[PDB]
Design a protein around this ligand. Sequence first.
Ligand SMILES: Cc1cccc([C@]23SCCN2C(=O)c2ccccc23)c1
Lengths: 373, 491
Amino acid sequence: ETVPVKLKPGMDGPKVKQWPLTEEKIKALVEICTEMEKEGKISKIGPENPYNTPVFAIKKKDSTKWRKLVDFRELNKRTQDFHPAGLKKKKSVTVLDVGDAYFSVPLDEDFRKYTAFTIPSINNETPGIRYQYNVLPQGWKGSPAIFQSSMTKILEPFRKQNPDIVIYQYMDDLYVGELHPDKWTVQPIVLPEKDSWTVNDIQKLVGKLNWASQIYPGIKVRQLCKLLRGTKALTEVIPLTEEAELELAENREILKEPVHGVYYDPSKDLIAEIQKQGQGQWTYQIYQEPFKNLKTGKYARMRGAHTNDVKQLTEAVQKITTESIVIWGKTPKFKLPIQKETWETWWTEYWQATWIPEWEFVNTPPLVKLWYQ
Amino acid sequence: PIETVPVKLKPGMDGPKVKQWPLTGKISNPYNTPVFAKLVDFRELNKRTQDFWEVQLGIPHPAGLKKKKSVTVLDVGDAYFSVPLDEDFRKYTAFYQYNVLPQGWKGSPAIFQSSMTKILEPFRKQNPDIVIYQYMDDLYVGSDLEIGQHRTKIEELRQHLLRWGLTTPDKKHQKEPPFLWMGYELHPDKWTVQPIVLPEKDSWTVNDIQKLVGKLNWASQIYPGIKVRQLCKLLRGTKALTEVIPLTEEAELELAENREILKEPVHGVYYDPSKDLIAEIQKQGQGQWTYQIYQEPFKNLKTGKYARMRGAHTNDVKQLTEAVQKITTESIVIWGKTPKFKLPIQKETWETWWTEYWQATWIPEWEFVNTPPLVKLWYQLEKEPIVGAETFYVDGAANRETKLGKAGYVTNRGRQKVVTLTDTTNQKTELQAIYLALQDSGLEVNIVTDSQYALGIIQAQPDQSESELVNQIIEQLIKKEKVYLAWVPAH
Ligand SMILES: Cc1cccc([C@]23SCCN2C(=O)c2ccccc23)c1
């Protein structure tokens, strides 16, 4: 039997537009749904139902069978309400898609209308097929919580027979400590080390240090700026007065470990920025308050993406989200350095996760990029 | 007897209890709704009726339809009156309550649609190659059956529908192709936009000039070459929608011109899923892009014009990119797939661009088409400071309230200049200083600035801007042999 679920007081169901899907994805969904209906998981709905949720198809990690993916982000923000600090230290964590379990459980009959979704038709030639779940749907925040007492009750023997291995559940996934979080390192700021220094060199250095001082105010560039006194040729080599060598040293030392007083407050949003460096390289930072980074990282594109910036980004975004969950138990809000339409058009092509983080689009400043590589 | 659609009212509300305005089997209780002549005012009820799933708000593009040997349209009479109204929800319609979907009610169009879809479903299962398109009261039915077999099939449809109380026009009273639908002229083997008659007047008012420009655009969808610029100067400063504006000497030119272009007829062919999709894009003037999509050389399915300044400072590459993104988005909607592109930019130009741009940017499978004008990059900022080139340390600053500023520089070679600006902004003075360094320097320069703002604009390699000043800076940059811009913190 079903457990009564509800939308937050006074709120109503989601009426989010369905984005255009390719023929391939429409046929795919149509085949998936036709059988889901046959198994009573989903059932067609009439016009009396005004709600809606976006849907699309993806292909899991190295699999060739399609996976229906429902963007319940809106429904999740309106669903009434109901972390292993050791997981991040583990040597090897594995991600198990245990999303199918949810189907065995029925969903409150009163809540179903809010799970409505539409499968579009090419060129609007037809009204589209409308369904609504009759069971706990994949990707909804209600499902993991409801199927909780049940999920534990089945993982009661394994964590008692093996109370060493850590089991963490986030949405449709299961993390058992394939990740290797004991190797995750934070990108520390790094000043250049060179035989000779030109005026230009020292300028860039002074620049980075100015910025760096926003996080580390102990940093002093007084001596270095004197070596800049005067209006000289950029290419003019400048020997370092010893007063500077020492000034450069302290800074280096100051930047050998993260800034102090940087704790994680689970009552605040987790934010993530990404910068495109080039050569298929991508930097990112996770924080909650400006300059107080919880983590800074680096991402190298995987093969079969050399020619595709969007794939790289989406792959990077998923890489970064996985780290968020594996560390804090939450997904961050992304600041994507990409034009919204470019992204909204192809992200679903390189996506493989079952959760969809929140995002927004920015205009990365030139300077900040010279400072993070 | 078609299944009934259950319907309630918005939580915490009750049926309309609006008094009757004094006046002179489809209908059989504290409610009432205004009725007179038989037109009912359900405005109140509608404001009480729940919400339903949207009606077909997106219509199909002819470009994306497949050729049919024969096509027919059937208008469904008394459509709404032919469908039963939720037995329970009936009371709220009293005025005498309804037993059928009321004309003018909120959920009528929707419930009807839903009903028609369910009635059609069976007949559809049995007739997989007979395509039916529902559009309000109309049923467009096309098939690949020969003239007679088709008629026989339409007759089956009519009967199936008749089983459900839905009556339709027999073969004698049906309207025959081509179909004039939403500004189009549909033939079973080709399409186009309905007739475009440019008025031949000698007294044009604002309303005439706007409607004209209105018709002109809608045609550009298939008639590439039309122009509206020399007519769209005729509206400038217009005092009223009846002010008669005399067509300038150049205004009669463009018109006569279009008038001639519109004389030659062009038809759009239909879509063939067995062949590939291809879009070619041309740079039609600064900021204007054209394109045509086809499967066979010159047999365009759809063509179009783009002119959108995505901001204030851009270039042809970024502009080329966006055009591709819009064409891709249309393509996915219309055909369900991305066409292969034929673009006027070399692989190496595009490579150099996306590889070093700070924003993720991508273009689906495409190939260079050598049709001038090609889109290129007008200048490349040096990646490292230039040896032997003079160095300009520039600076600008303006008081944000007096709008008074100064901009100038000082080079390693003793050159210096300070200019006073008026009615300027800080940003503008920062740009101005860079401008000056560029003006007064040789073919090779090293420029140091403390303006992140200017540094950002310029590093993005703009080649077109709204800012006269930015445009002068581009011109200079295009002339330089080498330009290395470098930042330094201010103060
Ligand atoms: C969107 C729309 C409007 C009217 C008629 C149709 C129509 S009638 C049936 C569906 N359509 C086709 O496949 C077709 C092909 C050529 C002419 C007409 C048609 C489609």
